[PDB]
Structures are given as structure tokens and as C-alpha cells.
């Protein structure tokens, strides 16, 4: 494996290097809906999915897994990863969600529930002063962790390396050992909520599908079908 | 399966 | 608030002592969908009464407004039942020990639609606990974290301070078992990541319990119904 | 809510 070999400071490089780009929406401000909005987010997520899949290949250890397991991990984690990316984007926009640079929304424009949860996560990141370096670690942890219970050993080793890396980072920022433990736990506990938001989100999308009003792209339908069968 | 392809390339 | 003045040895003891008892199912012995879901629903209902008592005894929980206490239990109750279940099931690889006289396997919950998915997830969590050699001391810390954490972002400093205290305590238990520093934060992380899976199982379970309520073939209790209604669900 | 009762008790 190539992943079990990295310095902590190396791991960060690779994860930072691997970051996907921030895509734009087709939002035209001259037009003011929940169907239009969801049409845009769906289009956006569909294009992001392509960059995420090619990002996943760049996560240390990921490429080492069998194609069936790679597929399973992404099927499982894709909305979690879209969502943590979103809340990170949105950190420095109190009260708003930066879906794209040209699409920055507040809770005012079920659906509200998810928004409020995304907003509270973004908010939590902000009060924690989350670092880009801590963030890319978390996002990688989600990709590897969320589908691991649903080869498995190699996965646990990379997770452990990413833990090592998170701690390496916090030691750098001057934190006492007690403070590193707590921050580490604090970050990983947010992933519980990110899982929650993803679940609620997936259910919302499943019912959008049935209503057949906001069409889902072909990949989004396949990834969504993964979560029901 | 689309994800399958894409991962493959 | 008293919770923050506890040592971590004092924390372990309050938690080990707050532990709810292990309830039995109805006696008398094959299962059908509805007799099975009856047994579990009855058991869950009786377990909830003890859970509330246990929650009132998790340090720092009573320091919360009545409303916030309510919010946390409503969000976390199935997570808490489920982690209890996989903890009991640890010594029974392959089976789910819902109650000492109610020890079920995969083939059994297959006679309910969508149940074997959840059975398999719960069993997988149980394996991982067993492979990690999860300790009772660690377990009660985890369960308390679920209670305080799962609902906190849908409301906090106090709670987060209590969450911190439990992290200290977890770590304290690890330093005792002779774990190196690296081993400590690797096992801390390993434990906490399984909380993400427990959350996933709860949400899957919650939708399933909502299917049931729409079927009206297994009657839910007034209380269970209120716990369930607080997730609103359906397809949320 | 039953929950309220059980908690105050
Ligand atoms: O078809 C889709 C797919 C994804 C989204 C999405 N977020 C949501 C998903 C479900 C419910 C609510 C939101 Cl905001 C989302 C999209 C892109 C992101 O970068 C983040 C989230 C919405 C509609
Ligand atoms: O009405 C109910 C309430 C709770 C349960 C329950 N587990 C499940 C819940 C939903 C789906 C599947 C299971 Cl196994 C469960 C009950 C008690 C426990 O100790 C653990 C789990 C089942 C039916």
C-alpha cells in the first residue's frame, strides 16, 4: 500500500492537492421557487459527483480497494461528502449556505429542517475555527468510514493514519494533549450529524423522485437507488 | 452502472 | 453544574451505577412478522421508562431545561436502545440478544420486510465491538455521548463541556489499560466513528417503525408513538 | 407529552 507510508505532513499535501474545484450554478438572479432551486442543486450535485469520484481516487488508500468496494463507499458517502463540502464553503457566511459562489441562500428562500441542520453544522465549524487541513481529513474519513460496515482491515489502517494526522495537526497549533483529545472527539462527533443530514436528505430526494417534478439526473438516480436496495 | 464505469476509466 | 467537578474515576462510577437493568421478553416460545414486532415493541416500550431514569442520572443531564432534556431523548432514544442491544449481543456472535430469553438471528427477522437489512447492520456493529474488545466502562461513556450529542445541533456550551468531560474520561480509561498515546487517540477515534453507524441504523430503524405505524398491524404504545412522532419522518 | 411526566417524576 502507498497510503500507510505517508508522513502526516505528506498526507495533508496529498489531500490538499486532491481537493475538487468549486462548481457554479446556473442560477439567474433575474428569475426568482422550491422546484427551481432543487433543479439547480440537482444539476450542481450531478456535476460535482464527477469531480468527487475523481477526487476519491486521489484519497490515499482508496485506489487500493476492489472496484466493488470503491463503488460501495461512494454510494454510501456521496451526499455526506457533498454536504460537508457545502458547510465548509459556507462557514464564513453566517446564516447562509453557499451551494455555489453564485448561489448563496438563507433559510427563508422538511426542506427547512435540512437547511437549518446544514446551517447549524456550518455554524459549529465556525465556532471551532475548523482548518482546511482538518477539513480535508474529515471528508476523507467519511468516504472510508460511512460504508465500511454495510480489505476491511486495510481500511482501518488508513483511518488510523488519518487520525494520526489530525492529532499531528492539533499538536502543531499549540494544543495541549487534553485539548487535542477533545477537539478530535468534537470533530468526529459532528460526523454523526453529517450522517443524519445525509439520511434525511436521501429520504427527501427519494420522495422528490416519486413526485416526478424535479427530474434527477441519471447518476443521481443510480446513487439514490443504491440507498433503497 | 454509471459510477462503475466512471471509477474504472 | 456538578458534572464538571467529577474526576474521571468518579464519572465512570456514576455511569456504571446509572445503568438500566436488562429486561426480559414474554415467556413461552417460530416467529411471524407481527408476533416478533409485538415482542420488540413491548420490550422497547418498557425499556424506555428505564432509559429516562438512566438519562436523569447522566451527570449534567438534569442541569438542562425540561424541554432540552425532552429534545435529546426524542432524538436519541433508538440510538440508545440499539447501542444497548449490540453491547448485549457482543458475547453472542451471530445473534441479537434483545432480551435474555429473546435471542434472535438473521433468518428470523427475514420474515419481516426490510428487517434483515437492520439486523445485519446491528450484527456488524456487534462484531466490531467484539473485535475492538469494547469495555463496559467505555460502553457507558459512548451511550452517554449519544444522549448528549445526537440532538445538540438541532437546538449548548454546558452540553459541549459535558461532552468534553466524557472524552477525558474515555481517554482516562485507555491510559489505564496501558495504551500508548498513539493507541489512545486511535481507539478514541475508532470508538466515535461507530457512533456515525449507530446513527445510520437509528434512522433506518425509525423509517421502518413508521412503515409499521402506517400498517396499523402492530399497535404502538402512546409513548413510543410520541417518541416516533418527534422525528416526523415518512420520507423526511 | 408522556415524556414530560416521566422526566419530572
Ligand atoms: O438532487 C439534489 C442533490 C443534492 C442536493 C444537495 N442538498 C440537498 C439534498 C437534499 C435535500 C436538501 C439539500 Cl439542501 C446538495 C447539492 C450540492 C451540494 O454541493 C450540496 C448539497 C440537492 C438536490
Ligand atoms: O417498536 C419497536 C421499537 C424498537 C425496536 C428495536 N429495534 C428495531 C427498531 C426498528 C427496526 C428494527 C429493529 Cl430491530 C429495538 C427494541 C429494543 C431494543 O432493546 C433494541 C432495539 C423494535 C420495535
XYZ file of C-alpha atoms and ligand atoms in Angstrom:
529
model
C 0.000 0.000 0.000
C 1.152 3.530 -0.776
C -1.042 5.115 1.883
C 0.432 3.514 5.005
C 3.722 5.252 4.291
C 2.937 8.945 4.407
C 4.243 11.462 6.853
C 1.382 13.304 8.470
C 2.531 16.458 6.642
C 2.571 14.389 3.433
C -0.968 13.079 3.890
C -2.131 16.675 4.178
C -0.319 17.648 0.967
C -1.960 14.838 -0.985
C -5.386 15.565 0.492
C -4.998 19.299 -0.159
C -3.706 18.660 -3.697
C -6.676 16.395 -4.337
C -9.384 18.935 -3.461
C -12.124 19.207 -6.051
C -12.922 22.583 -7.615
C -15.909 24.687 -6.609
C -18.532 24.489 -9.344
C -21.026 27.153 -10.369
C -24.804 27.064 -10.529
C -26.974 28.138 -13.468
C -28.778 30.496 -11.116
C -30.090 33.540 -12.952
C -30.854 36.230 -10.341
C -33.316 37.929 -12.701
C -35.628 34.974 -12.016
C -36.983 34.249 -8.552
C -39.087 28.581 -6.092
C -38.534 25.259 -4.349
C -38.750 23.423 -7.676
C -36.396 25.802 -9.492
C -33.946 25.774 -6.574
C -33.950 21.976 -6.411
C -33.492 21.857 -10.169
C -30.289 23.869 -9.760
C -28.933 21.913 -6.807
C -29.638 18.677 -8.637
C -27.779 19.909 -11.718
C -24.934 21.100 -9.463
C -24.658 17.880 -7.458
C -24.690 15.924 -10.708
C -21.645 17.821 -11.961
C -19.919 17.689 -8.548
C -20.319 13.912 -8.474
C -17.879 13.652 -11.366
C -15.181 15.657 -9.565
C -15.814 13.759 -6.316
C -15.334 10.388 -8.000
C -12.025 11.555 -9.406
C -11.103 13.055 -6.019
C -11.867 9.764 -4.257
C -9.252 8.017 -6.408
C -6.727 10.516 -5.007
C -7.504 9.750 -1.346
C -4.594 7.690 -0.025
C -5.561 4.036 0.205
C -8.811 4.389 -1.708
C -7.446 3.174 -5.041
C -6.089 0.081 -3.254
C -9.601 -1.266 -2.673
C -11.526 -3.516 -5.041
C -13.773 -1.779 -7.533
C -16.854 -3.243 -5.846
C -15.784 -1.749 -2.527
C -14.866 1.635 -4.013
C -18.353 1.710 -5.549
C -19.954 0.808 -2.229
C -18.102 3.514 -0.316
C -19.102 6.297 -2.703
C -22.704 5.089 -2.977
C -22.850 5.252 0.714
C -20.976 8.526 1.347
C -21.750 10.751 -1.662
C -24.360 13.062 -0.084
C -22.409 13.241 3.185
C -19.420 14.452 1.204
C -21.463 16.927 -0.850
C -22.913 18.179 2.438
C -19.690 18.574 4.422
C -18.207 20.324 1.394
C -21.166 22.686 1.440
C -20.994 23.535 5.133
C -17.230 24.169 4.809
C -17.855 26.512 1.842
C -20.499 28.245 3.919
C -18.518 28.692 7.142
C -17.800 32.377 6.668
C -21.354 33.197 5.593
C -23.326 33.239 8.845
C -26.952 32.353 8.185
C -26.398 31.235 4.599
C -25.481 28.183 2.541
C -23.009 28.723 -0.274
C -24.194 25.984 -2.630
C -22.139 27.704 -5.347
C -20.369 31.085 -5.475
C -23.370 32.410 -7.408
C -25.875 30.567 -5.217
C -25.787 31.731 -1.589
C -29.103 31.020 0.174
C -30.752 31.677 3.540
C -33.400 29.609 5.371
C -36.136 31.909 4.049
C -35.896 31.356 0.293
C -38.996 19.278 5.823
C -36.710 21.140 3.439
C -36.315 23.916 6.005
C -35.306 21.262 8.535
C -32.330 20.154 6.438
C -31.312 23.767 5.771
C -31.397 24.537 9.483
C -29.256 21.478 10.195
C -26.757 22.401 7.495
C -26.673 25.954 8.902
C -26.055 24.691 12.439
C -23.192 22.482 11.228
C -21.595 25.353 9.344
C -22.062 27.415 12.494
C -20.396 24.713 14.614
C -17.400 24.604 12.243
C -17.153 28.361 12.602
C -17.061 28.401 16.409
C -14.469 25.617 16.248
C -12.432 27.614 13.718
C -12.037 24.497 11.574
C -8.943 24.442 9.383
C -8.731 23.479 5.720
C -6.306 20.803 6.833
C -8.673 19.408 9.473
C -11.484 19.559 6.924
C -9.848 17.510 4.150
C -9.065 14.891 6.802
C -12.715 14.706 7.911
C -14.009 14.458 4.361
C -11.654 11.541 3.703
C -12.715 9.868 6.946
C -16.340 9.989 5.806
C -15.552 8.379 2.426
C -13.776 5.492 4.133
C -15.884 5.100 7.269
C -19.505 5.513 6.279
C -19.803 2.337 4.210
C -17.284 0.091 5.955
C -19.963 -1.932 7.815
C -22.511 -2.480 5.078
C -9.644 -5.454 2.899
C -11.806 -4.069 5.703
C -8.598 -4.219 7.724
C -6.585 -2.151 5.220
C -9.333 0.452 5.505
C -8.967 0.650 9.269
C -5.223 1.260 8.888
C -5.790 4.328 6.677
C -8.394 5.663 9.081
C -5.816 5.268 11.826
C -3.283 7.168 9.688
C -5.807 9.984 9.196
C -6.339 10.043 12.962
C -2.574 10.257 13.437
C -2.665 13.162 11.007
C -5.456 15.081 12.745
C -3.551 14.818 16.016
C -0.272 15.854 14.318
C -2.069 18.978 13.108
C -3.518 19.926 16.514
C -0.142 19.463 18.193
C 1.161 21.993 15.654
C -1.463 24.618 16.553
C -0.157 24.567 20.126
C -2.871 22.437 21.730
C -2.205 20.523 24.946
C -2.736 16.760 24.848
C -6.030 17.175 26.665
C -7.023 19.798 24.100
C -6.081 17.570 21.169
C -8.213 14.714 22.515
C -11.233 16.946 22.939
C -11.008 18.662 19.579
C -10.528 15.296 17.877
C -13.617 13.886 19.576
C -15.512 17.103 18.798
C -14.766 16.828 15.065
C -15.719 13.164 14.826
C -18.950 13.723 16.732
C -20.049 16.173 14.022
C -19.789 13.310 11.517
C -22.708 11.745 13.381
C -24.813 14.740 12.377
C -23.465 14.768 8.926
C -24.658 11.164 8.671
C -28.039 12.319 9.985
C -28.385 15.131 7.438
C -27.435 12.723 4.659
C -30.134 10.263 5.764
C -32.855 12.930 5.927
C -31.588 14.328 2.647
C -31.710 10.950 0.933
C -35.290 10.458 2.078
C -36.249 13.911 0.792
C -34.727 13.092 -2.601
C -36.477 9.739 -2.729
C -39.832 11.483 -2.406
C -38.852 14.136 -4.954
C -38.162 11.270 -7.325
C -41.605 9.722 -6.908
C -43.318 13.085 -7.387
C -41.532 13.264 -10.752
C -41.440 17.064 -10.877
C -37.781 17.838 -10.262
C -36.112 15.257 -12.500
C -32.977 13.614 -11.171
C -30.007 13.064 -13.493
C -29.105 9.502 -14.444
C -26.223 9.182 -11.959
C -28.134 10.739 -9.062
C -30.944 8.240 -9.660
C -28.462 5.352 -9.602
C -26.745 6.630 -6.457
C -30.113 7.251 -4.828
C -31.365 3.789 -5.780
C -28.302 2.413 -4.007
C -29.858 3.592 -0.729
C -33.084 1.683 -1.287
C -31.989 -1.820 -2.390
C -23.850 1.158 -13.667
C -22.572 4.706 -14.204
C -20.487 5.004 -11.017
C -18.850 1.724 -12.010
C -17.690 2.998 -15.364
C -16.511 6.358 -14.098
C -14.450 4.748 -11.358
C -12.937 2.411 -13.972
C -11.595 4.846 -16.635
C -23.066 22.344 37.336
C -21.886 19.293 39.314
C -20.860 17.322 36.234
C -17.682 19.242 35.559
C -16.271 18.740 39.065
C -16.181 14.953 38.782
C -12.864 13.201 38.338
C -12.956 10.688 35.551
C -12.878 7.784 38.021
C -15.916 9.420 39.661
C -17.516 9.744 36.220
C -17.107 6.066 35.374
C -18.748 5.101 38.669
C -21.800 7.348 38.274
C -22.316 5.934 34.775
C -21.683 2.290 35.704
C -24.183 2.826 38.503
C -26.830 4.587 36.404
C -27.039 1.535 34.130
C -30.598 0.372 33.391
C -31.466 -3.253 34.119
C -31.696 -5.970 31.483
C -35.379 -6.608 30.811
C -36.939 -9.891 29.702
C -39.432 -10.617 26.957
C -42.644 -12.629 27.415
C -42.011 -16.244 28.264
C -43.317 -19.176 26.177
C -41.616 -19.990 22.877
C -41.096 -19.890 15.446
C -41.883 -16.248 14.826
C -44.088 -14.322 12.449
C -43.574 -10.671 11.484
C -46.264 -9.435 13.866
C -45.536 -11.642 16.874
C -41.898 -10.601 16.552
C -42.608 -6.881 16.194
C -45.032 -7.170 19.102
C -42.364 -8.604 21.390
C -39.814 -5.961 20.430
C -42.275 -3.080 20.641
C -43.454 -4.179 24.081
C -39.842 -4.559 25.202
C -38.802 -1.189 23.756
C -41.724 0.465 25.493
C -40.762 -0.927 28.904
C -37.068 -0.159 28.275
C -37.908 3.497 27.560
C -39.201 4.005 31.098
C -35.821 2.887 32.493
C -33.913 4.896 29.876
C -35.480 8.128 31.094
C -34.407 7.223 34.634
C -30.947 6.499 33.383
C -30.849 9.800 31.478
C -31.751 11.784 34.614
C -28.643 10.227 36.188
C -26.151 11.018 33.452
C -24.108 13.831 35.044
C -25.139 17.227 33.707
C -28.362 15.942 32.160
C -30.620 17.206 34.965
C -28.929 20.616 34.710
C -30.822 21.039 31.418
C -34.215 22.651 30.842
C -37.093 20.166 30.780
C -37.554 20.949 27.099
C -33.936 20.301 26.139
C -33.949 17.037 28.084
C -37.025 16.089 26.089
C -35.352 17.068 22.810
C -32.283 14.915 23.462
C -34.196 11.762 24.402
C -36.588 12.183 21.481
C -33.662 12.446 19.060
C -31.522 9.716 20.629
C -33.792 7.042 22.119
C -33.488 4.456 19.319
C -29.731 5.004 19.042
C -29.574 4.344 22.770
C -31.726 1.194 22.589
C -29.686 -0.038 19.642
C -26.245 0.505 21.193
C -27.532 -1.293 24.282
C -28.621 -4.174 22.068
C -25.286 -4.533 20.260
C -23.491 -4.313 23.618
C -25.622 -7.183 24.986
C -25.142 -9.121 21.756
C -21.341 -8.963 21.919
C -20.821 -12.321 23.585
C -23.257 -13.915 21.147
C -21.535 -13.669 17.762
C -24.151 -14.182 15.058
C -27.152 -13.336 17.241
C -29.009 -10.313 18.598
C -29.772 -10.549 22.320
C -32.849 -8.350 22.573
C -33.590 -9.904 25.986
C -32.026 -12.904 27.782
C -34.981 -15.048 26.674
C -35.150 -13.366 23.281
C -32.003 -14.081 21.332
C -32.593 -13.771 17.583
C -30.646 -14.346 14.377
C -30.725 -13.189 10.738
C -33.168 -15.769 9.364
C -35.741 -14.698 11.892
C -36.106 -11.033 11.066
C -36.259 -12.059 7.426
C -39.936 -12.761 7.991
C -40.379 -9.002 8.205
C -39.798 -6.849 5.131
C -36.703 -4.648 5.449
C -35.726 -6.077 8.810
C -32.776 -8.180 7.727
C -31.028 -5.026 6.489
C -31.177 -3.607 10.008
C -30.391 -6.975 11.606
C -27.224 -7.242 9.509
C -26.131 -3.701 10.427
C -26.690 -4.332 14.129
C -24.795 -7.624 13.935
C -21.915 -5.944 12.100
C -21.723 -3.289 14.820
C -21.666 -6.074 17.392
C -18.739 -7.800 15.642
C -16.764 -4.568 15.556
C -17.375 -4.039 19.288
C -16.170 -7.554 19.973
C -13.129 -7.173 17.713
C -12.300 -3.893 19.467
C -12.748 -5.637 22.831
C -15.074 -2.820 23.895
C -15.181 -2.478 27.681
C -18.268 -1.835 29.811
C -16.607 1.304 31.116
C -16.061 2.512 27.540
C -19.552 1.416 26.553
C -21.354 3.523 29.155
C -19.257 6.519 28.093
C -20.332 6.000 24.479
C -24.013 5.713 25.361
C -23.843 8.975 27.321
C -22.162 10.678 24.375
C -25.053 9.608 22.149
C -27.588 11.022 24.621
C -25.892 14.412 24.800
C -24.586 14.685 21.249
C -27.202 13.404 18.811
C -29.681 16.213 19.436
C -27.314 19.057 20.301
C -27.090 20.587 16.784
C -30.837 20.828 16.416
C -31.096 23.164 19.397
C -25.174 24.125 24.314
C -21.890 25.180 25.903
C -22.715 23.194 29.038
C -23.533 20.134 26.924
C -20.308 20.510 24.936
C -18.433 20.925 28.207
C -20.019 17.732 29.462
C -19.142 16.025 26.165
C -15.534 17.133 26.722
C -15.508 15.674 30.227
C -16.593 12.306 28.881
C -13.835 12.437 26.239
C -11.323 12.990 29.065
C -12.869 10.041 30.866
C -12.786 7.726 27.874
C -9.114 8.623 27.423
C -8.556 8.110 31.161
C -9.803 4.531 30.810
C -7.445 3.969 27.882
C -4.380 5.239 29.715
C -5.226 2.727 32.449
C -5.397 -0.308 30.152
C -1.778 0.567 29.315
C -2.396 2.061 25.885
C 0.358 4.197 24.365
C -0.500 7.783 23.421
C -0.950 6.914 19.760
C -3.029 3.876 20.678
C -5.225 6.137 22.804
C -6.304 8.570 20.083
C -6.581 5.778 17.517
C -9.003 3.852 19.736
C -10.826 7.073 20.736
C -11.452 7.818 17.055
C -12.342 4.199 16.270
C -14.986 4.221 19.011
C -16.505 7.542 17.986
C -16.762 6.690 14.282
C -19.063 3.762 15.114
C -21.446 6.388 16.513
C -21.971 7.501 12.915
C -23.081 3.984 12.019
C -25.321 3.762 15.092
C -26.956 6.989 13.901
C -27.459 5.491 10.448
C -29.079 2.397 11.960
C -31.440 4.528 14.052
C -32.675 6.478 11.029
C -33.173 3.264 9.059
C -34.969 1.772 12.051
C -37.092 4.889 12.504
C -38.408 4.761 8.931
C -39.211 1.122 9.423
C -41.151 1.775 12.618
C -43.032 4.399 10.593
C -43.944 1.803 7.946
C -45.421 -0.260 10.763
C -47.443 2.668 12.131
C -48.935 3.170 8.677
C -49.793 -0.547 8.527
C -51.544 -0.479 11.937
C -50.983 -4.248 12.291
C -48.645 -3.849 15.241
C -50.030 -1.283 17.696
C -47.513 1.211 19.006
C -47.793 2.471 22.570
C -48.744 6.075 23.332
C -45.190 6.854 24.461
C -43.385 5.078 21.616
C -45.728 6.938 19.272
C -44.697 10.270 20.767
C -41.006 9.392 20.502
C -41.602 8.414 16.890
C -43.726 11.457 16.016
C -40.835 13.701 17.104
C -38.919 12.635 14.015
C -41.959 13.435 11.862
C -40.458 11.148 9.245
C -42.479 9.410 6.477
C -39.946 10.321 3.938
C -38.037 13.103 5.609
C -46.239 14.633 26.328
C -45.860 11.464 28.363
C -42.134 12.189 28.109
C -42.605 15.308 30.224
C -44.302 13.326 33.019
C -41.712 10.589 33.092
C -38.914 13.153 33.321
C -40.405 15.270 36.118
C -41.004 12.136 38.148
O -30.659 16.490 -6.248
C -30.051 17.084 -5.257
C -28.859 16.589 -4.837
C -28.199 17.197 -3.808
C -28.714 18.298 -3.176
C -27.990 18.886 -2.138
N -28.504 19.190 -0.947
C -29.663 18.782 -0.509
C -30.067 17.483 -0.688
C -31.260 17.016 -0.202
C -32.034 17.889 0.497
C -31.614 19.179 0.699
C -30.427 19.659 0.221
Cl -30.036 21.165 0.511
C -26.686 19.338 -2.380
C -26.223 19.577 -3.651
C -24.936 20.031 -3.865
C -24.102 20.271 -2.825
O -22.867 20.709 -3.027
C -24.558 20.031 -1.559
C -25.831 19.583 -1.336
C -29.921 18.788 -3.616
C -30.596 18.184 -4.650
O -41.354 -0.828 18.304
C -40.058 -1.124 18.287
C -39.151 -0.357 18.956
C -37.817 -0.682 18.934
C -37.346 -1.753 18.235
C -35.991 -2.093 18.246
N -35.278 -2.355 17.144
C -35.665 -2.122 15.922
C -36.307 -0.974 15.592
C -36.674 -0.725 14.292
C -36.363 -1.637 13.326
C -35.702 -2.790 13.646
C -35.341 -3.045 14.946
Cl -34.588 -4.326 15.220
C -35.365 -2.344 19.470
C -36.084 -2.529 20.632
C -35.465 -2.777 21.847
C -34.101 -2.834 21.906
O -33.506 -3.076 23.056
C -33.366 -2.633 20.757
C -33.996 -2.403 19.553
C -38.267 -2.509 17.587
C -39.606 -2.208 17.601
